[PDB]
Amino acid sequence: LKLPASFDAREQWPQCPTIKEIRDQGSCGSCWAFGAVEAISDRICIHTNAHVSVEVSAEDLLTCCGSMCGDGCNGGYPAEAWNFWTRKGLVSGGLYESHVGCRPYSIPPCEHHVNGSRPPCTGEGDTPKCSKICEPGYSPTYKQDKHYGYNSYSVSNSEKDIMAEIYKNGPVEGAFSVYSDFLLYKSGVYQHVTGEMMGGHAIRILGWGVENGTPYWLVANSWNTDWGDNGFFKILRGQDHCGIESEVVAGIPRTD
Template identity: 25%
Template sequence: MVPWLQLLLLLGLLPDAAPAPKKPRAAGPQARELASPELLAPARFALEMYNRGRAAGTRAALRAVRGRVRRAGRGSLYSLKATLVEPPCNDPTVCQLPISKKTLLCSFEVLDELGKHMLLRRDCGPVDTKVTGAGTAQDAGRAQVRPHGGFSPNSSLLEPSPDDTNETFSSFLPLLNKDPLPQDFSVKMASIFKEFVTTYNRTYDTKEEARWRMSVFANNMVRAQKIQALDTGTARYGVTKFSDLTEEEFRTIYLNPLLQEEPGRKMRLAKSVSGLPPPEWDWRKKGAVTKVKDQGMCGSCWAFSVTGNVEGQWFLKQGTLLSLSEQELLDCDKVDKGCMGGLPSNAYSAIKTLGGLETEDDYSYRGHLQTCSFNAEKAKAYINDSVELSQNEQKLAAWLAEKGPISVAINAFGMQFYRHGISHPLRPLCSPWLIDHAVLLVGYGNRSATPFWAIKNSWGTDWGEEGYYYLYRGSGACGVNIMASSAVVN
């Protein structure tokens, strides 16, 4: 076994896994519901991976499972929803669940290829824990997360030096090696969590909720350090405004599962640009990119990716940079699902059918579904068509430099804790099978001989590098080349 796979096994991020296979064509209509007996083998494998490294008496048990399978080539991809039961835990700063809370709802993605299983995703969260007095803990967590505020560009928590980052996380390194926790772990964690609460203006309704969020925060610091240890680029991971959210909450609130689940409208393939791309390019310097926006607690990344692309196309054809309305797409695109997700291909079609996009000023963003109030007389930008782009990254770079910013979709692995630098996760951790976030390519280049894509995100300027994400270029990292597209403005 190659050394990095052994490291993945040791850290528990990808137990018993082989390198990710090439993504087969989407199974689409072949996906089907399965009866429970057919799910037992992949479910038991997922449970085994969940329990790996746990002592007897602390292992979870499988209570129920349901799911679907997609057949592709020689493999089957199982999407499972499993209920697990854990023994009670007595230390909320290090346990996955608070005291006496023991039932979990887990989402697993298990690939079965020629009889060998591989765990591609594991998202688990509590389902029977009362945090605010009603509903499940997962529901309560979503309901009680406060809007982000209090960004301070001078805060050491937001922009530490590499030395500061290493010092901050030194307390968590023993967890990676399964050594005993240092005696002052809880004290240090409480201090870091208090700084996080102050920096991001967090408030919690009850002491129980605050203790729960601190336990989530502690687990996330360990996760961030594991991601840091396995990144082969220059990225730094650590405390962000999302650090008190469970992985399941973060995916549910901010990401877009429809990108991997539905094929969307078929677009014609764009003609490739001839010649080699320039060594570097940045449409921000050319005036073709609006300021970074914030989708808020809504899975509307698809709308922001598409409007960003149309803004660039309109600028290049008409010479005017307009900030266009994402809310119009949330309200009026009846094919996509608003804050529950959508597909760029459908959004292009909606813009063309509606008759254009209004500006942000005329149809402002609210971050939740409203009644469609589009006024064709106020439409300021129009498109004539949309095209799918090549999956060859060199051809993508050439197209971008000549034609403008590109709508793409990526696997958001690690982005919950991304702070700055060029992200380059190992391929099995950031598989193109699991694309779940739409963004905008605005440029490319090199930093200290490391090639990157410059990506405009939609989580506000208090995330990443002033709202931007930098991803390794040239290896199809995180599926960045899989779903590239653009509007056409004549």
């Protein structure tokens, strides 16, 4: 209760479907946008006591943020994603071909270093256009459909601070240095052992726990459910491992 040994947002906010949700960024380096919108989704539902529960649109953020956020499918930055939500807001939008919400994701699901029936993920494709319109059959206007953030912030490189933030306000977006052995993750607690550095990856942190004395963070990847542990993974917590505790960002939904 002053930080229990383990915490899982799905259990704290059982009426919030998005927290339990794994998405797929497709052949696009949109991890920066998915960890952001995934957490925004979660916080919207947490902030409203599930009175409002929507899929925030990775599509809106990825196509419309623009240079502020980086280079679309060519990679981007978490801090600027949340800042963009506080100023321009984000509309709802679901999975590929879901017809859910205002602007569903337009990049098809693919296999991310795993065997499946979807085509393998090819590189970072092109970034779609920013079209401020909702799908036909979605009643409210894109403008009326925007959900703004009251604020955004970078949480310090502090384990306690990160736990307290998730505990009180919900899931966060974080980022870490990906080494080759992370691609191969299947289950258990991920700890870097072999491999070279492949740049960084953005994700959603939604909990923490302890596996046989090993503290870990509960994370959602954006590589579909057939990757890793049903799309989630665990990673060593408390050691700023692969920088897991250095790039944490979040913010509070704007009520109105």
